[PDB]
Design an enzyme around this catalytic site. Structure first.
Site, PDB file in Angstrom:
ATOM      1  N   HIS A  41      -3.785  -5.994  -7.046  1.00 49.60           N
ATOM      2  CA  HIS A  41      -2.448  -5.811  -7.915  1.00 49.60           C
ATOM      3  C   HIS A  41      -1.153  -6.395  -7.091  1.00 49.60           C
ATOM      4  CE1 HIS A  41      -0.288  -2.838  -5.324  1.00 49.60           C
ATOM      5  NE2 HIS A  41      -1.598  -2.066  -5.107  1.00 49.60           N
ATOM      6  N   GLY A 143       5.009  -0.515  -0.299  1.00 49.88           N
ATOM      7  CA  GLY A 143       4.871  -1.750   0.719  1.00 49.88           C
ATOM      8  C   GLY A 143       3.617  -1.505   1.656  1.00 49.88           C
ATOM      9  N   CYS A 145       0.546  -0.343   0.750  1.00 48.27           N
ATOM     10  CA  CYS A 145      -0.497  -0.996   0.008  1.00 48.27           C
ATOM     11  C   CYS A 145      -1.286  -2.006   0.842  1.00 48.27           C
ATOM     12  CB  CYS A 145      -0.490  -1.339  -1.508  1.00 48.27           C
ATOM     13  SG  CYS A 145       0.061   0.010  -2.547  1.00 48.27           S
TER      14      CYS A 145
HETATM   15  C1  LIG Z   1       1.437  -0.008  -3.118  1.00 51.26           C
HETATM   16  O1  LIG Z   1       2.214  -0.100  -1.686  1.00 51.26           O
HETATM   17  C2  LIG Z   1       2.062   1.236  -3.852  1.00 51.26           C
HETATM   18  C3  LIG Z   1       2.371   2.301  -2.792  1.00 51.26           C
HETATM   19  C4  LIG Z   1       2.751   3.558  -3.729  1.00 51.26           C
HETATM   20  C5  LIG Z   1       3.959   3.452  -4.064  1.00 51.26           C
HETATM   21  C6  LIG Z   1       4.914   4.818  -3.757  1.00 51.26           C
HETATM   22  N1  LIG Z   1       3.717   5.648  -2.867  1.00 51.26           N
HETATM   23  C7  LIG Z   1       2.591   4.862  -2.733  1.00 51.26           C
HETATM   24  O2  LIG Z   1       1.531   5.208  -2.009  1.00 51.26           O
HETATM   25  N2  LIG Z   1       1.200   1.394  -4.922  1.00 51.26           N
HETATM   26  C8  LIG Z   1       1.499   0.959  -6.228  1.00 51.26           C
HETATM   27  O3  LIG Z   1       2.525   0.376  -6.488  1.00 51.26           O
HETATM   28  C9  LIG Z   1       0.682   1.305  -7.433  1.00 51.26           C
HETATM   29  C10 LIG Z   1       0.474   0.165  -8.112  1.00 51.26           C
HETATM   30  C11 LIG Z   1      -0.499   0.193  -9.014  1.00 51.26           C
HETATM   31  C12 LIG Z   1      -0.803  -1.095  -9.921  1.00 51.26           C
HETATM   32  C13 LIG Z   1      -2.065   0.473  -8.402  1.00 51.26           C
HETATM   33  N3  LIG Z   1       1.255   2.123  -8.380  1.00 51.26           N
HETATM   34  C14 LIG Z   1       1.299   3.595  -7.997  1.00 51.26           C
HETATM   35  O4  LIG Z   1       0.993   3.990  -7.083  1.00 51.26           O
HETATM   36  O5  LIG Z   1       1.881   4.433  -9.031  1.00 51.26           O
HETATM   37  C15 LIG Z   1       2.403   5.521  -8.731  1.00 51.26           C
HETATM   38  C16 LIG Z   1       3.783   5.125  -8.210  1.00 51.26           C
HETATM   39  C17 LIG Z   1       4.537   6.732  -8.293  1.00 51.26           C
HETATM   40  C18 LIG Z   1       5.682   6.534  -7.576  1.00 51.26           C
HETATM   41  C19 LIG Z   1       6.310   5.445  -7.124  1.00 51.26           C
HETATM   42  C20 LIG Z   1       5.676   4.201  -7.428  1.00 51.26           C
HETATM   43  C21 LIG Z   1       4.172   4.249  -7.840  1.00 51.26           C
END
Ligand SMILES: *[C@H](O)[C@H](C[C@@H]1CCNC1=O)NC(=O)[C@H](CC(C)C)NC(=O)OCc1ccccc1
Ligand SMILES: *[C@H](O)[C@H](C[C@@H]1CCNC1=O)NC(=O)[C@H](CC(C)C)NC(=O)OCc1ccccc1
EC number: 3.4.19.12
Lengths: 305, 305
Positions: A41, A143, A145
């Site tokens: 992603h 960040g 991920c």
């Molecule tokens: C990647 O670092 C990020 C980590 C999430 C962001 C907030 N806490 C985490 O563990 N993951 C994502 O951005 C992910 C991307 C998708 C395309 C897989 N989206 C996600 O996790 O959705 C839920 C979310 C909830 C609250 C804030 C941001 C994302």
């Protein structure tokens, strides 16, 4: 003396962490030999992450659109592929710090250490269980991920996890290093949820053993029980049904404590039906299920690497 | 999302750990430049450790009686001295892995990561608070002595702890890197005990903030209080008296949550006088005092190194 949630030492993995930028999206990557591994992603704009076509999105990307940085050194990307939900970037340099390593898909109930990273820099290390519902209860901010979970067997790093997402509950989901999610999760910002989580019964028993060994025993009763009648009580409390294999695995602890597993099961049933009455066990006021029988042995047998 | 007890990454310190043998006694040592630091009780037979004369015991020791091993490489000892309860061995080689570092005596309430070692090999990493009674609640088995506690500020390792002993309670005591014990402890196998431990009030408030931020709020009430009347209740529960400086330090968290510190203090008083009624906060059924305001900020601001 003392029983603590303990992470493996993180040095070996620290030297494998890089930063991967694709456009405006920066996350972490794992550099082993001439391959960097990262969540796919990274190739998504903010619009894309609602319903992405990763095949179509990668088609428009070239090697030069991937900025990979180790420390301040930039690696040259000389090839890219998508394997499930991970991207493998081929780079011009092999990691000179590449440790002896393996990629392992881990079973639910099993534990691992997580090296939480931002911008390719280690932030900190904690231990996690893969929960029966295939979520983990970590600390991941945006960040994070591409941060990974691992075990170390003497010299060999066994990578089992890479971070991709958080769920509404505030729990976390991710893949193995072949890019296959644990659980029924998909990398899109959709309504997603995990099933009911179960208490990992085998791991709670082991923690009870660890207590006896450390001198906590109030919870020990004067009774025993039967697997079947124990589990009748397990069912109601969303505890995992205990098996003979489980009993075998606790045998070492049973032996070193002189407490038969089924006697300890009787103790457990009382705590489930009666609570801990404000009392604590190893300074927890609840029952811990995130310690494997082995985790306990190692910690009560001082095993290193 | 998620709030976990998090250790610093241990790579930098891992490269400073050696094994030190004196006769039959093997423990760990910290190698920085041409000096290895270790607990002085390495020079004690089993008889000696009841009432040792370390001056007299060292007088009978020479450089060649100290076997120091890095990995499989033996270091040549070319000088020795005793500084308080630590021994400084001068060696022929300076550690090529010596990191940027500092030696800091830490204040009670403050936290640090511990790299638990046996035979000069890292076993695992966990975080600890220096308790008000100057003990720590760690996981140390025999062979763990010379294991160290540290903080990392970006690039600089700040060593604050070296392990020497366990107390009857199963808690642990040790020195700073100048060999001065934290607390009233002495390196002899005598009857020793620490005072009453206090709950680190400032750290419990910070943990409450971390909860709000992570979405736990049931505990929030509709009232406020006064420092003085809060502390009247603190007294009875063996909580540390809270100060204006403490309130200032929580200001950042107060601000980011929009909850005045004294409103949160009212919430706290209710939990102390009413319990958590089987409810949990960040998945703890008790109040955690081993998270510094800063520990929380970093973990809720994703700080790395
Ligand atoms: C990647 O670092 C990020 C980590 C999430 C962001 C907030 N806490 C985490 O563990 N993951 C994502 O951005 C992910 C991307 C998708 C395309 C897989 N989206 C996600 O996790 O959705 C839920 C979310 C909830 C609250 C804030 C941001 C994302
Ligand atoms: C050094 O590795 C060792 C670690 C202790 C041993 C058990 N758990 C620990 O943390 N410390 C000592 O051996 C120490 C030596 C004195 C001369 C300072 N003695 C000590 O800790 O006494 C208490 C004790 C209780 C139970 C077993 C062994 C020692």
């Amino acid at each position: 003396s003392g029983f603590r949630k303990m992470a493996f030492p993180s040095g070996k993995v620290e030297g494998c962490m890089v930063q991967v930028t694709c456009g405006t999206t920066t996350l972490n990557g794992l550099w082993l030999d001439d391959v960097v591994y990262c969540p796919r992603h990274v190739i998504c704009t903010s619009e894309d992450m609602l319903n992405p076509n990763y095949e179509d999105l990668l088609i428009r990307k070239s090697n030069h659109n991937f900025l990979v940085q180790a420390g301040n050194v930039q690696l040259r990307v000389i090839g890219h592929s998508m394997q499930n939900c991970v991207l493998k970037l081929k780079v011009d340099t092999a990691n000179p710090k590449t440790p002896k390593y393996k990629f392992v898909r881990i079973q639910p109930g099993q534990t691992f250490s997580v090296l939480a990273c931002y911008n390719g820099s280690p932030s900190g290390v904690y231990q996690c269980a893969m929960r029966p519902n295939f979520t983990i209860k970590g600390s991941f901010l945006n960040g994070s991920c591409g941060s990974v979970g691992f075990n170390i067997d003497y010299d060999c790093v066994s990578f089992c996890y890479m971070h991709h997402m958080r769920l509404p509950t505030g729990v976390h989901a991710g893949t193995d290093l072949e890019g296959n999610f644990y659980g029924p999760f998909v990398d899109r910002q959709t309504a997603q949820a995990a099933g009911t989580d179960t208490t990992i019964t085998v791991n709670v028993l082991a923690w009870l053993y660890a207590a006896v060994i450390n001198g906590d025993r109030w919870f020990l009763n004067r009774f025993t029980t039967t697997l079947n009648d124990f589990n009748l009580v397990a069912m109601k409390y969303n505890y995992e049904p205990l098996t003979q294999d489980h009993v075998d695995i606790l045998g070492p602890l049973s032996a070193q404590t002189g407490i038969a597993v089924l006697d300890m099961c009787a103790s457990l049933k009382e705590l489930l039906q009666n609570g801990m009455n404000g009392r604590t066990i190893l300074g927890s006021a609840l029952l811990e299920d995130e310690f494997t029988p082995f985790d306990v042995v190692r910690q009560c047998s001082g095993v290193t690497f």
